[PDB]
Ligand binder design. Structure first.
Ligand SMILES: CCCCCCCCCCCCCCCCCC(=O)OC[C@H](COP(=O)([O-])OCC(O)COP(=O)([O-])OC[C@@H](COC(=O)CCCCCCCCCCCCCCCCC)OC(=O)CCCCCCCCCCCCCCCCC)OC(=O)CCCCCCCCCCCCCCCCC
Ligand SMILES: CCCCCCCCCCCCCCCCCC(=O)OC[C@H](COP(=O)([O-])OCC(O)COP(=O)([O-])OC[C@@H](COC(=O)CCCCCCCCCCCCCCCCC)OC(=O)CCCCCCCCCCCCCCCCC)OC(=O)CCCCCCCCCCCCCCCCC
Ligand SMILES: CCCCCCCCCCCCCCCCCC(=O)OC[C@H](COP(=O)([O-])OCC(O)COP(=O)([O-])OC[C@@H](COC(=O)CCCCCCCCCCCCCCCCC)OC(=O)CCCCCCCCCCCCCCCCC)OC(=O)CCCCCCCCCCCCCCCCC
Ligand SMILES: CCCCCCCCCCCCCCCCCC(=O)O[C@@H](COC(=O)CCCCCCCCCCCCCCC)COP(=O)(O)OCC[N+](C)(C)C
Ligand SMILES: CCCCCCCCCCCCCCCCCC(=O)OC[C@H](COP(=O)(O)O)OC(=O)CCCCCCCCCCCCCCCCC
Ligand SMILES: CCCCCCCCCCCCCCCCCC(=O)OC[C@H](COP(=O)(O)O)OC(=O)CCCCCCCCCCCCCCCCC
Ligand code: HEC
Ligand code: HEC
Ligand SMILES: COC1=C(OC)C(=O)C(C/C=C(\C)CC/C=C(\C)CC/C=C(\C)CC/C=C(/C)CCC=C(C)C)=C(C)C1=O
Ligand SMILES: [Zn+2]
Lengths: 441, 50, 122, 48, 464, 108, 59, 55, 50, 70
């Protein structure tokens, strides 16, 4: 028979505290970074968590796509962690499921990320599986052909949300170059896709100076010493189509959209490279948070709006801070007027309580992004890929050291720059486009 | 040929030479049905598509 | 017996080459390849490996099969100009089928069955 | 390709074979047919 | 063979010793106030965020027929204004501490909690005590929420899985308190008022049934002082009206039964089959956790389902029997539920049902050791993933003090998991599954779901 | 179609009229239909024979002789039924040898 | 209300290979009892008329 | 190809060959494949010299 | 997924919609042919013995 | 019925625009010789084995009858 001691009772003398308590480190751990002799940068941060997260960041995404290889990042999200030169798909799946580890492939607009999350006792297995699935991937014909269907329903489901479509068209209108390409493409774009297209895209994006290995809860010396023979990469840097902000306006026609969506955006100058400008953009995003759901079942009523959803994206060298607001189909001009009034009242000055509230909201978001080990590893990897360092302490200091005059100056400089304007839905009521982009001038 | 020989032998009388030949024919019938068909067939598959 | 087995390996190669030459001479009169003899209804590993091929290869295989069946119905052979171009030992199915069989061997050592069944028509 | 072809290819491992418990549960059907035959014939006290 | 790419890792499932992970896991401190309220903290050494809240051993089970739905209506009302703070005052003060309040109401458990930063522990304690003790419960807000609930009831605005599970609880626990829904019927909402809410909170929200659990960046002594200042005025509990006396007075009953909710033009076919499982205090609940890991779960957005370790996941993914499914293991104070829930359509519903029944009965006879070692490793890894988020740490602290009576240490939990072997799995499956009555619930396009006799016949094998 | 309205005509059409068959079958694929024809012939001749045969000792030999010399067309019926067993076995044996030659019993 | 015992279930009912020989011995004894009852009733009713009654009478 | 058109006449040809052999066996050599001893009435006390079955 | 988009029910407080949104634990079966046992009656059934 | 991907052009002629039995008299010796060339080895193997073993058995039977002959 099995154990019969009930869980309200303590387990018997075969329940030992044989591992002693290890003493805590004296200070909060710092991020330690170096570079391999192949040129791949390795950055890691130690944690007290029992979960180690390993993520591999490669420059690419929608910004590295061509018209021939259109939608290759979305296919790479599904086709990753399959048969390699050393393991089959069955062997990799069983080796991940044996240690209880999880894998993801995640494609941004300027990068693709591959990651394995496991416990602290299986970090060598996770590192070896991740490196083998990234470096030595095969991308066989039949597996890509069978994955294309699931890619098509995942894109079709992701395009059901109007905010995703508005974000795509807004990035198209705001930028010319790499950042204007479409991430969530139409399903019919990848109808002629083959494994040669994915192999061509992977050969373009892969280079030793465009790959960053980020780890959370892993010793740095051990990680470099055991990843030197695994991340010895070769290849040439395919040219990157640098993007520029130009602004403009566009439209979308949706036949059975029960609402109408309006997007307004500006450029965050400096991109992710400038700490202060990104902090000010995050504060502006929090200042535009009209209906934040801080409590269950709370009903904040607006006169015109149905939903408000701001954002602040910080790419390399340039950014895009703005707001998307919904509304009734017959009240779209009122939605535009209210959005312009909100940005103009922000430019008229912020009043102490709002500044403190938005600073606390930005600090809470920044600290809750890095609370878990996979989130911290992703943040370290993205920051090192975009800049060369992780500066969360400096970002928190910039958020806390922000005055109302600096924010008012930031919004004043924003409204002088030409904006980006996108509509959506069965558009049967709209003010003319010339008067749309006049209220900030 | 083995099966037709067994058909011919059944209409004869019992004789030591016919007993010996019938025993050899029965042994070869079992040998073909149980040894030639799996093993020679596997060798043919290894020759053709191996 | 390993020393006699080492002597039997060039013997195995010699009998394999002689068999392949004779059968390929018999095969080329119908335009068939060696890989065209494998039947999906007979073997589920072949049925799965044929599913992993690009469609032009399957079209070419089906055309060769129909040509050979027409020749068999006519009790004829290929013309000599066409018969001189035949290459019955050109492989299109061997690597795919080998990888399918290796996958089925690797799954069986851990207790897993094959992820494909026999073909049923009912 | 069901039968000797399965064992020539290496598809019959120590795994995918029936366990000892499975063979014992199948092997317990040997007594059922013996008891059924003895019930049908009834050769009482016939054991030598 | 690659030298660096083929070491350290292999697909052969072997038991892993998780003992060195116990050296750095933090400790839980519990302090019992004279009120009877327990204050339990778990300090993570370099955390910047804090989850803290109040867990209550109450819910829809401890209601009556007359006030069924009061506990769910309470989380609609409680955040709409207190006697010291208005709606806007509460909104501004919560916004300034950078967090969000949240609430869950189960059949037997209720929590109200806050995810804040470490500098806002005392403010969160004060706010949580303010909603919990000094609420307005205004009749105008009650009328303003009654009509919204009545509209979403008239529209049948519900998740499909929640619909199926509510039908399953209603038919498996007939004529017992666990068969009621958390939402309650339409008539109780149509005749709700402030008096019932006051009486429910006065009866059930007492000292020995309430845990203040905080995890992340928090000091134990300061939380003790803050809780004694704020939550020190809660009434104590009579001995005659404790949780155990209420459990004895109205016990749970399991009845083998069948229900389907048929719709004329639906597309999906959701179905759940459950057996009577174990209570929280049964020592067989750990093998049921291992068996639930062995059955696993799968949805069709994954493409590696054919290489799964689980045989049920392999069968469903290879033959395409369901769009998604999951095995569940629900535990209550004196009973439980164990089974599989899935989503399919009407042409694959019988084959999915057969796959569920055949994989459940198979665990009584043939269980190999590799599957058990794999499931033990996966369950221990899943337990280590919950330690990464302070919200899950606080939730586990509250749940474990409410339902076990104590904080089970991680070493004891690993030792209790490691004591499970294949014979234990066969014994527990024989106890709970083999030749037993089950409960069947379905909703949607369910005209081809087999009836109860088909499900009852397939709980045993005639060939052994 | 007329065969699509009566279920007997649908089965007969599907399995005897429109059934797809390989076009390169030679004359060694006629063993089965010949075996079926011989089975039907044996059944017919025997059912006719059993109307003049008496299954008792001291009547069986005399009933076969009365069948041979006195029943109209009885000698034809007896000799046909006797040699039809031989031809039935010839055809079935050649059928089995065909299946042995071509490996016709293999999967599926 | 009335319910089969668990310990008696685990012995003679859970496996078919144990259930079937028990079924056969119960069938044997049921046939013996039915034979005994029918023969006793027939011999009691028709006493003095059978052949064995005349033979035992002539002893 | 369809069975009922193409393989009906092909079966009819072989059936006509079989009917020719059958007619030869019935009408010209009716006792060729048999045994002459089966034209003797059965005697349980006297056995024939050679006891062989049909071919 | 939502039941309004998947099951697509009619709107209203019909008898089927009331049980769909909140099923009752007081299920009444028909008892003209068979009277039920008390709910939660445990034990292996007596019908095996019969 | 199955779907077979295939690229071809098929030509068929009417049965009444062709001769029925007039190339049989021309192809008859070639068909005979091709049949015996294709199946020559197996028929020879069967005949040699059957008739040689039958002749050896018959000769030994005659010898054994002569050995007991007075
Ligand atoms: C009484 C003894 C029977 C016995 O030993 O059963 C063992 C054997 C194992 O059954 P099991 O594993 O306990 O349950 C069946 C599985 O769950 C698998 O069941 P399934 O859901 O795959 O469906 C199988 C289904 C359907 O099975 C079939 O494929 C059709 C069966 C046709 C049998 C009926 C023909 C009646 C006479 C016409 C000739 O079989 C039945 O309806 C039950 C047995 C049929 C008798 O049961 C049989 O299949 C009986 C064999 C038939 C002889 C009686
Ligand atoms: C005087 C006798 C010599 C006749 C002259 C032969 C020269 C021309 C042969 C030829 O091509 O004739 C065309 C043609 C024969 O067709 P085929 O395309 O050569 O295929 C039949 C061969 O046996 C082709 O047979 P296979 O390619 O299937 O070879 C396998 C066969 C080997 O068959 C043989 O070697 C002959 C059977 C020896 C016993 O193995 C067996 O022994 C299996 C027994 C099957 C019985 C075959 C009849 O002649 C006819 O149209 C004859 C009609 C026969 C109808 C009656 C069938 C049942 C009685
Ligand atoms: C022994 C002689 C056979 C030697 C080989 C030979 O001549 O080849 C068969 C030869 C057909 O040669 P082929 O053109 O290569 O045809 C191949 C097909 O497999 C043959 O076509 P299939 O097998 O699909 O069936 C058709 C076959 C049907 O014929 C047979 O199955 C062969 C029996 C024909 C009677 C020959 C009498 C000798 C044996 C009795 O041929 C005929 O239609 C024969 C012509 C009809 C005779 C006149 C009607 C009035 O048919 C003949 O018997 C030749 C016609 C001369 C008649 C002789 C009097
Ligand atoms: C051998 C014939 C069947 C024997 C009866 C039998 O197997 O019972 C059937 C059902 O019985 C029948 O349908 C058969 C009844 C007629 C019996 C006739 C037997 C003939 C015997 C002839 C002599 C040999 C299933 O019940 P078991 O698995 O054996 O019992 C346990 C069942 N449960 C786990 C659910 C508690
Ligand atoms: C003629 C050769 C045979 C012979 O001489 O028989 C004596 C026998 C007559 O013996 P007699 O009375 O001594 O002349 O000949 C026949 O009548 C047999 C003719 C048919 C040959 C048999 C072929 C089919 C049977 C074998 C297949 C069975 C296995 C299939 C698996
Ligand atoms: C490799 C090892 C094997 C594992 C894979 C195979 C497997 O799991 O099996 C599934 C397998 C097919 O799965 P797949 O090969 O993976 O597609 O199914 C079979 O085993 C089918 C076998 C067909 C032959 C049945 C033989 C019946 C014997 C008794 C017949 C009785 C007479 C009937 C007629 C009488 C006249 C009325
Ligand atoms: C021991 C084996 C065996 C015996 C005896 C046998 N068959 Fe066949 N039969 C087969 C096989 C195998 C096939 C499939 C041949 C193929 O498609 O290659 C077949 C095919 C057939 C066909 C399709 C046409 C053909 O000839 O290929 C018919 C009709 C047929 N059998 C009828 C019969 C009848 C009627 C009998 C007896 C009265 C019989 N068979 C006896 C094995 C046998
Ligand atoms: C596979 C072979 C076979 C089949 C099928 C068959 N028989 Fe015959 N039957 C024989 C043989 C051989 C004899 C012996 C004939 C003889 O030597 O006179 C015989 C003899 C008989 C006799 C005795 C009279 C006589 O002349 O010998 C009768 C009556 C008879 N069969 C009836 C039937 C009937 C009725 C059927 C079918 C419904 C049938 N047979 C089918 C082989 C067969
Ligand atoms: C490889 O391709 C194939 C062949 O090879 C070209 C075949 O040959 C056949 C099968 C051939 C068939 C079915 C026709 C042969 C005849 C048979 C089996 C039966 C013989 C019956 C006859 C002559 C008439 C019987 C008459 C009566 C009245 C009996 C019925 C009784 C009643 C209605 C009461 C098939 C399926 C085939 O696929
Ligand atoms: Zn509710």
């Amino acid at each position: 028979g099995g154990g019969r001691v009930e869980v309200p009772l303590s387990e018997k003398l075969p329940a030992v505290t044989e591992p002693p308590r290890t003493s805590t480190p004296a200070t909060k751990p710092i991020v330690q970074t170096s570079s391999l002799r192949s040129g791949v940068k390795v950055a890691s941060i130690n944690t007290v968590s029992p979960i180690s997260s390993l993520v591999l960041f490669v420059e690419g995404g929608a910004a590295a796509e061509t018209p021939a290889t259109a939608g290759a990042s979305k296919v790479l999200e599904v086709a990753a962690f399959k048969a390699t030169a050393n393991r089959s798909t069955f062997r990799l799946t069983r080796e991940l499921e044996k240690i209880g580890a999880t894998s993801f492939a995640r494609a941004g607009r300027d990068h693709v990320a591959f990651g394995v999350d496991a416990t602290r006792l299986n970090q060598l297995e996770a590192l070896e599986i991740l490196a083998d699935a990234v470096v030595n991937a095969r991308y066989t014909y039949w597996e890509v052909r069978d994955s294309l269907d699931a890619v098509k329903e995942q894109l079709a489901a992701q395009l059901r949300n109007p905010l995703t479509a508005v974000n795509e068209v807004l990035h198209r209108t705001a930028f010319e170059g790499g950042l204007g390409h479409s991430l969530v493409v139409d399903p019919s774009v990848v109808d002629g896709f083959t494994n040669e297209t994915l192999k061509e895209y992977v050969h373009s994006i892969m280079a030793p100076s465009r790959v960053v290995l980020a780890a959370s809860g892993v010793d740095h010396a051990e990680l470099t010493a055991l990843a030197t023979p695994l991340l010895n990469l070769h290849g040439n840097a395919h040219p990157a189509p640098q993007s520029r902000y130009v602004g403009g306006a566009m439209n979308i026609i949706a036949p059975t959209s029960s609402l109408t969506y309006v997007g307004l955006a500006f450029e965050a100058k400096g991109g992710a490279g400038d700490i202060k400008s990104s902090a000010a953009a995050s504060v502006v995003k929090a200042l535009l948070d009209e209906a934040r759901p801080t409590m269950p079942y709370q009903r904040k009523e607006h006169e015109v709006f149905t939903s408000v959803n701001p954002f602040a994206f910080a790419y390399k060298g340039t950014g895009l801070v703005g707001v998307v607001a919904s509304g009734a189909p017959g009240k779209a001009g009122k939605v535009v007027d209210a959005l312009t009034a909100k940005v103009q009242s922000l430019a008229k000055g912020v009043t102490d309580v709002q500044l403190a509230t938005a600073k606390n909201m930005a600090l809470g978001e920044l600290r809750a992004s890095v609370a878990t080990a996979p989130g911290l590893a992703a943040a370290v990897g993205s920051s090192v890929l975009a800049t060369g360092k992780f500066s969360a302490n400096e970002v928190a200091a910039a958020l806390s050291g922000l005055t109302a005059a600096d924010v008012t100056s930031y919004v004043n400089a924003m409204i002088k720059t030409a904006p980006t304007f996108v509509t959506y839905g069965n558009l049967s009521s709209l003010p003319r486009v010339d008067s749309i982009a006049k209220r900030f001038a | 040929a083995d099966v037709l020989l067994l058909t011919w032998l059944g209409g004869n009388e019992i004789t030591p030479i016919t007993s010996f030949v019938g025993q050899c024919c029965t042994a070869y019938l079992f040998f073909y049905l149980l040894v030639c068909q799996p093993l020679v067939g596997y060798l043919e598959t290894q020759f053709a598509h191996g | 017996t390993s020393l006699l087995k080492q002597v039997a390996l060039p013997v195995f190669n010699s009998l394999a080459t002689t068999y392949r030459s004779v059968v390929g001479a018999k095969l080329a009169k119908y335009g068939l390849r060696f890989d065209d003899l494998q039947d999906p209804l007979k073997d589920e590993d072949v049925a799965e490996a044929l599913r992993r091929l690009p469609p032009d290869v399957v079209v070419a295989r089906n055309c060769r099969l129909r040509r050979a069946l027409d020749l068999s119905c006519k009790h004829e052979a290929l013309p000599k100009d066409l018969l001189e171009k035949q290459t019955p030992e050109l492989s299109y199915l061997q690597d795919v089928l080998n990888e399918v069989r290796a996958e089925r061997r690797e799954r069986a050592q851990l207790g897993a069955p094959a992820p494909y069944t026999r073909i049923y028509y009912d | 390709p069901i039968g000797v072809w399965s064992v020539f290819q290496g598809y019959v491992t120590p795994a995918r074979l029936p366990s000892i418990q499975t063979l014992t549960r199948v092997g317990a059907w040997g007594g059922v047919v013996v008891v059924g035959g003895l019930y049908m014939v009834q050769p009482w006290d016939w054991l030598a | 063979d690659a030298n660096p790419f083929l070491r350290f890792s292999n697909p052969r499932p072997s038991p892993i010793d998780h003992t060195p992970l116990l050296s750095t896991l933090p400790e839980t401190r519990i302090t019992t106030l004279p009120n009877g309220l327990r204050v339990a903290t778990e300090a993570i050494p370099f955390a910047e965020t804090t989850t803290l809240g109040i867990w209550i051993n109450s819910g829809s089970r401890f209601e009556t027929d007359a006030n069924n739905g009061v506990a769910h209506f309470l989380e609609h009302i409680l955040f709409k204004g207190t006697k010291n703070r208005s709606v806007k005052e509460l909104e501004v003060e919560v916004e300034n501490m950078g967090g969000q309040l949240n609430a869950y109401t189960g059949r037997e458990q209720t929590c109200y909690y806050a995810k804040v930063m470490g500098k806002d522990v005392g403010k969160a304690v004060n706010i949580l005590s303010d909603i919990l003790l000094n609420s307005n419960l205004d009749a105008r807000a009650i009328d303003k929420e009654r009509d919204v609930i009545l509209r979403e009831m008239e529209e049948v605005n519900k998740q499909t899985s929640e619909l199926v599970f509510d039908h399953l609880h209603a038919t498996a626990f007939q004529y017992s308190p666990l068969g009621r829904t958390i939402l309650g019927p339409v008539e109780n909402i149509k005749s709700i008022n402030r008096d019932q809410l006051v009486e429910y909170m006065k009866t059930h929200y007492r000292g020995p049934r309430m845990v203040l659990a905080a995890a992340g960046a928090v000091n134990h002594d300061e939380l003790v002082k803050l809780a004694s200042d704020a939550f020190g005025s809660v009434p104590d509990e009579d001995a005659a009206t404790s949780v155990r006396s209420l459990l004895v007075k109205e016990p749970s009953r399991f009845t083998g039964s069948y229900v389907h909710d048929r719709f004329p033009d639906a597309s999906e076919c959701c179905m759940a089959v459950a057996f009577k499982g174990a209570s929280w205090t049964d020592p067989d609940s750990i093998p049921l956790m291992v068996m639930q890991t062995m059955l696993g779960g799968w949805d069709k957005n994954s493409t590696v389902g054919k290489h799964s370790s689980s045989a049920l996941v392999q069968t469903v993914a290879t033959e395409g029997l369901a769009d998604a499914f999951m095995a569940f293991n629900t535990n209550y104070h004196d009973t439980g539920l164990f089974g599989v829930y899935g989503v399919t359509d009407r042409d694959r519903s019988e084959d999915f049902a057969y796959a569920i029944m055949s994989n459940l009965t198979r665990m009584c006879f043939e269980v190999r050791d590799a599957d058990v070692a794999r499931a033990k490793n996966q369950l221990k890894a899943s337990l280590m993933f919950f330690q990464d988020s302070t919200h899950h740490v606080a939730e586990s602290i509250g749940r474990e003090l409410l339902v076990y009576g104590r904080r089970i240490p991680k070493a004891e939990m690993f030792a209790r998991i490691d004591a499970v072997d294949a014979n234990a799995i066969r014994a527990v499956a024989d106890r709970f599954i083999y030749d037993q009555d089950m409960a069947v619930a379905s909703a949607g396009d369910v005209q081809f779901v087999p009836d109860y006799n088909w499900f009852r016949r397939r709980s045993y094998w005639l060939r052994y | 179609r007329m065969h699509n309205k009566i279920q007997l005509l649908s089965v007969l059409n599907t399995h005897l009229v429109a059934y797809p068959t390989p076009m390169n079958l030679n004359y060694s694929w006629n063993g089965g239909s010949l075996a079926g024809m011989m089975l039907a012939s044996q059944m017919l001749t025997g059912i006719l024979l059993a109307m003049h045969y008496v299954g008792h000792v001291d009547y069986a030999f005399a009933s076969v002789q009365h069948l041979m010399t006195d029943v109209p067309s009885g000698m034809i019926l007896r000799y046909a039924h006797a040699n039809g067993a031989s031809l039935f076995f010839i055809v079935v044996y050649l059928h089995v040898l065909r299946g042995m030659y071509y490996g016709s019993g293999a999967q599926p | 209300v009335m319910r089969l015992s668990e310990a008696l279930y685990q012995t003679f009912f859970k496996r078919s290979t144990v259930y079937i020989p028990m079924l056969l011995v119960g069938a044997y004894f049921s046939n013996e009892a039915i034979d005994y009852a029918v023969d006793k009733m027939w011999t009691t009713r028709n006493k003095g008329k059978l052949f064995s009654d005349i033979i035992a009478e002539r002893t | 190809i369809s069975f009922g058109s193409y393989f009906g006449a092909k079966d009819l040809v072989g059936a006509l060959f079989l009917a020719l052999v059958f007619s030869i066996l019935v009408f010209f050599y009716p006792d060729l494949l048999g045994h002459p001893d089966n034209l003797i009435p059965a005697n349980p006390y006297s056995t024939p010299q050679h006891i062989v079955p049909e071919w | 997924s939502d039941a309004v988009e998947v099951f697509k029910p009619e709107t209203g407080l019909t008898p089927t919609n009331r049980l769909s949104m909140a099923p009752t634990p007081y299920i009444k079966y028909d008892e003209h042919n068979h009277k039920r046992f008390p709910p939660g009656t445990e034990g292996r059934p007596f019908a095996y013995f019969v | 019925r199955q779907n077979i991907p295939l690229r071809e052009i098929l030509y068929q002629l009417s049965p009444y625009q062709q001769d029925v039995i007039r190339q049989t008299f021309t192809n008859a010796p070639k068909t005979f010789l091709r049949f015996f060339k294709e199946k020559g080895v197996g028929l020879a193997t069967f005949g040699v084995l059957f008739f040689g073993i039958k002749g050896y058995t018959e000769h030994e039977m005659h010898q054994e009858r002569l050995a007991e002959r007075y």
